[PDB]
């Protein structure tokens, strides 16, 4: 077999491997999510269609459970491994506990894999960073992002991909107690967050929303143009 | 590069172990204090943006009822040790039916520090050294005790110890504020004085976490209510 | 070796004195000289658009009339020269100040060494450009020294004697370029040092349990 | 060191000024000078197809040089002084954008060091063009001196004819060089501008 | 295991890319032209033949076209060595599906199953990745007629029409023009593919030997896969040569 | 345990590239499929008279109806011999029938691919040329170390193989009897081989309805008379 | 970026007009001038190696050389014209330089080696003209200096070395200049695929 | 690039000439000059037993209380050596471009057949560098000797001026035999080396190759 | 290409003669010329330890005749022919070793690498021998300009001592050349004869082809 240490220390303690893994995260497509009151909204922008590529296989918005969904930005190959292994463990937790999976439980079940596989012998660090968003008991939403280094954090509003810092600048300034107060405000603020990274596309933007105990629902492109129709 | 993790220096020291201690300077500052009335732990949440929730940040973890812990350095390596230290602590009570001495807590964790290698190992073998520094406080039959470990695995009984990026000037400041019989509440005051000086941000009630253990009270984390009463005494 | 107790302490005091003496320059004078030459480049003498009047026409037919230098360029050098010489003094003071921060020689703790070597290399690279200005200022006198001589030496060609005047405008155009570069050196050295003060001042961590 | 709000802001504004200049350079000043000196080579003075018109024969004091060629050299001089100054603004700005030293993340270092060496070596060649301008002044002048010393061999007058050829041949080529100093480098800078304006820095802040 | 002999293929580039993966797609970029078209009444997959010699045999079937199962089929562009193992593994995977589920495999399941194997070799093991890109056709009970595309990095996606190998971008540009979604049927897509094959191929004198065409359609509840005989392709050449010049 | 074969900056495998360059300089070998039989004529050249020709033979049968020749390394070929013969045995274990040539070459060529991936091992240095007889239709296949197997009516392999292919391109065509297939295989072999030609210098074997059989030096001398 | 959004089509001057202008010199000028010097080098003016027959009569114990102007008339415009086309080949490749990045250096390394050969040709044709100008300065300075030697026949007889080298180098210049056309035309045409298309842009999302 | 039917054909005719000159270079020029430079060193000019015969007398007297001319023998020996150097250099440039025409485009795969061409290319430039040095020294031998003579007449004082120009005659003569020997040795040695690597020189790879790379 | 039968005959006659040329120099010249220059260096002509009497002082005022150094000029009869002879024969050794270079291979070239490393050392000998050819002719050009300038200057007498320093360098080289040329004969014999087996047999010719 192949047994060797891959990730090794440097004179400064930084890890060149992990740092290059985060560079591939920055070059991923822009994805964003925001915690509302009783709702959460995920969105991602895919501009690549000359009418050729099918829209069924492109979807980057995935659901870990009925109450937990996710979106990813990074290498699309590494995401398929993490999403599958997260769902296997997420349902294995429902095997151990009759109660559903709290969003914080599964986020530890995920970031820990990026911890092991980074420092494991012969393995490779993941080049993806994903937003795990869902609803805890009583209906309290939670939003968590992983790190190729294996760390995770809580966020009221967060974004990933190219220009992720630029989207946070609009979230940091425009997210107040007035924000995400009702359903109409949550939908507009997530769209308005994506309106700056728009590269002249009026449909390519994809959105999804989950409300309370209802399963994840995808908002069709025709209502996207209707909600983008009200801007000024 | 052109060497293994086991390759010695011309001075005879492992490169991977040397760089492990050098990586702690990038971690979070936590200052433990050992007193006759208990052991005090304080750490900063290090919030770089209002969007984050302070509830998700726990830099002080509880190993046992009377035994606390502190955290710094690399976060990824610590969550593996915090769970492993807990299991061995319960394996003690599962075997001897007693509370593990904090010295034995430092002993069981120090065993897995230098186990790392490449050849002649199992699939459960670690490739890279731990980039985490730990502080074990607690009270036992010998009274309040505060211990420290490094990536090399050396554990030493300490009256006061500081970890993180600010440990350079904080450890020197602990020698000044610590004199003889100084109590827990007085150590809490001196803890906030040194911690406020070493941080770049402003000291707030919700900015830092404060937890103390006592001989007559179990390890307790001060909530937002009590934290407002503690910072008021400055 | 034999270490004299009195002589060893004298060096320690001097390593500390020049350490704090160079801090006065790196803090006060470096950003002060940046805007000092910013008013020098904005001098109306350097803002003249037409260089035809800025040249110094020579009278070339010996009894030939006295032929001084360019009163425009030499007057500008009067402000530029003391600033070029001063920075060359500052650069060595920065190099030695970095040499004071050289940690005890060992295999490890070399990350702070690689940073201070790249800073000292750039300060030496800038200092090389500073003494290059020292050469070009002395070159203008060798340029006009050989040009005016050969111009007055050759009376047969009526052109080359009048074509050496282009080096007066060339010295002016390069002078405004040096004022921009001399001011840049104060800005380049300040920004590189000021942003790196974290690892320059504390290259060694002093952790050896 | 302490923070001085006066002297420190002077450095920040000076760095932000060169940032605004570099943006004004690429957006306005550079493409204006690109089309300006591209039409300067399209000038029929530099398009001359017969070098015999530019040959100045010696009278064998009644000695001169071709006035058209000298003016072309007098027009070539400030245009090279124009490119040197505008590149020093970019050269200084890039040296003022240098992020803190790291052993890794050298992509942005290679971006800055490459264009820095290109502009620095260009300034050397641009100063070499100034040497060529003053050289051709001394070449024909000394060739007439040897022609006046021995007004016998006819190749003395043919030497200054070859010089008038070598002057104008190199002028048109040096104008092509400074035209590439603008446009070719402008395209190189524009390609490494958009997302590579700050290739290192404003990056580590991913989280 | 001397260290100096390990290239460490798991090293990320400073831009976050894999060298061995990018060099794999470049080797695929030199492979012959292979295309496929999803149509209403069937799926069409055609390709050229780069090996041409008077002494060649080719008495079997197609060159780059393989049959995965009764309801599916695939093409090949890349190194023929790695293609044989992938063709074996795909058939093994599609058959292991028949073990547990005892039904024809959905075209989506077979793709993600091999891609999980491709990713695993780039993740660990030290072995070189695979240099073959594969196209997939077939029918399933859910989504019906299907056309997919795979990359050696393990990435895949659904396609109505696509092309791989040489002249890929040239064929894709023509698919963005002539191809009519939800209108042209399998019969009209056959004449369209021949038109794209002839224009994108700079080598003149297209013959029934030099090209290959295979069709898969569902008729009367049974999947019908065929490869057009050289005479049948020659008949299509006679049809296209009137609609080219005349 | 790490793979010795990696992708070049141009995408081509570096290790197998030298494998194909190795078999290109081996012993000259030619073969022809004509009418009801296939003729295999190779080169066995001994560097001295002390060498016993009956001890080592280059033409070896795989089974009754199948035979194989080679141009390339000696040692790597006998490893192919054992594994290909054991593959035909494991074939006859399961299927209890003579093995078809298409299936025999396919799984043997897959062994050549295993060492372009598995670590610590070099690829094979032998290019195999397989002959087979099944269901009344003769088979002539060509395999190289890369693992890709083809089919040919006639071909050449070994030193100066390009000339042998061009020669058979001109001379050889359809409607050649097995007697003409031997004579034609000798003529293309006279071009690549240099020096005096005897029955010991060349090792010839054929495969027909009666199966793959090797020619005895007596009947080879009869063909050295330019008769058939 | 905060850049002015105008003058977007001004890039088409060099990226299209000059780009296609450099093309016209690649497939037309370069191959047309290969056969031009091929017949020009074979001219008997260059083929005659005789020292005295080629050079002008030298009277010294002050005439110049008018016979060298016969070859210099044809050589000078041929050496200079390529020297300009070398610049146009450089810029033509400069527009083909991909955006600054680490990887994809295979086509870049090819372009670097082609530009190195273009600079090597430009440097050598520049040294040719420099030597061409040296013919007039030396021939005049030699005769002026050789006129001093009267009783010395050794120096004057050895001045003819540059009289022979004047013509022997011109034939070497025409031969090397033709090799430069053949070199630049062959190397650029063989690598034309990688020079024009250093990056295929196959990267998906 | 657009196709020029006449221009590209003349480039092929150019390559045809280089193929003709290369064959005449190996088969004709080399062995002819080997035997010619044999008799050139066997010539009594360079076979001279007493070099005083080829010593051109130059007497610059010193006062105590002229007959200057060129050396016909040494110059003509170098007058024959110069075109022999010039001819082979022109021929090396013919096979240099011919080698360049036989070098394919830039590719890493199977580039060692080109590396063999690069080794011989270095051998062609190594001889070219020496041949450039030979003619350069000869031009310097003429310049420095003619200068040393006129400086001797300029300073009829030091007797070493008279001895210097006399030793230059003996130095140039022995330089003739060495250069001719080195050049003659260069014909046969380079010839035998080319024929060894001529397989890769003319055909680095085949004509048209490859199977599913 | 195409070649005449006599073209290969010119190579074979060349190969046989070049073989005997290297055979003579190895087994005749190399052993015998060491004791030659050893006795020459120890001969009274080259063994003089007094360099003050070996100088050639000249009066500096119908001016008197100004010869060279009779010692240096006559002691060249021992040096100069061995300088030309060794260089001429090293060429034949270089030609011989280069002629035994087999077909250039990208591997198994170690036998060729031994030849190349010998070619570099034999050419290094040839380089120093060429430096001796320079020193022989440079002494006549340098001293000529030195004594004439010493003759042009009656105001400064010590130029004669500067001219004397050229004498010490000349005779110092006369002993140094016969010492180095002898070391060359010694180094060449030790390097060639010991490595002769590898140069004559660069390839085993066991190729299976």
UniProtKB/Swiss-Prot annotation, chain A:
Location of Phosphotyrosine modifications: 152
Places the protein is found: Cytoplasm; Nucleus
Keywords, ordered alphabetically: Acetylation, Cytoplasm, Glycoprotein, Nucleus, Phosphoprotein, Proteasome
Any Pfam family hit: Proteasome_A_N
UniProt-listed InterPro entries: Ntn_hydrolases_N, Proteasome_alpha, Proteasome_alpha-type, Proteasome_asu_N, Proteasome_sua/b
Organism: Bos taurus (Bovine)
Function of the molecule: Component of the 20S core proteasome complex involved in the proteolytic degradation of most intracellular proteins. This complex plays numerous essential roles within the cell by associating with different regulatory particles. Associated with two 19S regulatory particles, forms the 26S proteasome and thus participates in the ATP-dependent degradation of ubiquitinated proteins.
PROSITE patterns for the chain: PROTEASOME_ALPHA_1, PROTEASOME_ALPHA_2
GO cellular component entries: cytosol; nucleus; proteasome core complex; proteasome core complex, alpha-subunit complex
SUPFAM superfamilies named among the record's database cross-references: N-terminal nucleophile aminohydrolases (Ntn hydrolases)
Predominant location: cytoplasm
GO term, biological process aspect, one: proteasome-mediated ubiquitin-dependent protein catabolic process
Family membership noted in the UniProt record: Belongs to the peptidase T1A family.
Coiled coil: none
Superkingdom in the source lineage: Eukaryota
Residue positions where N6-acetyllysine is found in the record: 226
Name of the protein: Proteasome subunit alpha type-7
Sites where a glycan is attached: 129
Curated annotation (Swiss-Prot), chain B:
Main location per the UniProt record: cytoplasm
Pfam families: Proteasome (PF00227), Proteasome_A_N (PF10584)
Disulfide bridges in this chain: none
Lineage: superkingdom: Eukaryota
UniProt GO cellular component terms: cytosol; nucleus; proteasome core complex; proteasome core complex, alpha-subunit complex
Compartments where found: Cytoplasm; Nucleus
CDD domains per record: proteasome_alpha_type_5
Modified-residue entries (Phosphoserine), positions: 9, 49, 56
Phosphothreonine carried by residues: 48
Gene Ontology annotations of biological process type: proteasome-mediated ubiquitin-dependent protein catabolic process
Subunit structure: The 26S proteasome consists of a 20S proteasome core and two 19S regulatory subunits. The 20S proteasome core is a barrel-shaped complex made of 28 subunits that are arranged in four stacked rings. The two outer rings are each formed by seven alpha subunits, and the two inner rings are formed by seven beta subunits. The proteolytic activity is exerted by three beta-subunits PSMB5, PSMB6 and PSMB7. PSMA5 interacts directly with the PSMG1-PSMG2 heterodimer which promotes 20S proteasome assembly.
Protein family membership: Belongs to the peptidase T1A family.
Name of the protein: Proteasome subunit alpha type-5
Source organism of this protein record: Bos taurus
Gene that encodes the chain: PSMA5
UniProtKB/Swiss-Prot annotation, chain G:
Pfam family membership, one: PA28_N
GO annotation terms (biological process): regulation of G1/S transition of mitotic cell cycle; regulation of proteasomal protein catabolic process
Entries under SUPFAM superfamilies matching the protein: Proteasome activator
Stimuli inducing this protein: By IFNG/IFN-gamma.
PANTHER family tied to this protein: PROTEASOME ACTIVATOR COMPLEX SUBUNIT 2 (PTHR10660:SF6), PROTEASOME REGULATOR PA28 (PTHR10660)
Role: Implicated in immunoproteasome assembly and required for efficient antigen processing. The PA28 activator complex enhances the generation of class I binding peptides by altering the cleavage pattern of the proteasome.
Name of the protein described by the UniProt record: Proteasome activator complex subunit 2
Keywords: Acetylation, Phosphoprotein, Proteasome
Gene3D superfamilies found in the cross-reference section: Proteasome activator pa28, C-terminal domain, Proteasome activator pa28, N-terminal domain
A cellular-component GO term for this protein: cytosol
Top-rank taxon, per record: Eukaryota
Subunit architecture: Heterodimer of PSME1 and PSME2, which forms a hexameric ring.
GO molecular function: endopeptidase activator activity; identical protein binding
Protein family per UniProt: Belongs to the PA28 family.
Residues where Phosphoserine is found: 4
From Swiss-Prot, chain H:
Swiss-Prot/TrEMBL keywords: Proteasome
Descriptive protein name: Proteasome activator complex subunit 1
Induction: By IFNG/IFN-gamma.
Species of provenance: Homo sapiens
Entry keyword Mitochondrion: no
Range of residues in the leader sequence: none
SUPFAM superfamilies (UniProt xref): Proteasome activator (SSF47216)
Function according to Swiss-Prot or TrEMBL: Implicated in immunoproteasome assembly and required for efficient antigen processing. The PA28 activator complex enhances the generation of class I binding peptides by altering the cleavage pattern of the proteasome.
Keyword rRNA-binding: no
GO cellular component: cytoplasm; cytosol; extracellular exosome; nucleoplasm; proteasome activator complex; proteasome complex
Family: Belongs to the PA28 family.
Quaternary state and interactors: Heterodimer of PSME1 and PSME2, which forms a hexameric ring. PSME1 can form homoheptamers.
GO biological process, one term: antigen processing and presentation of exogenous antigen
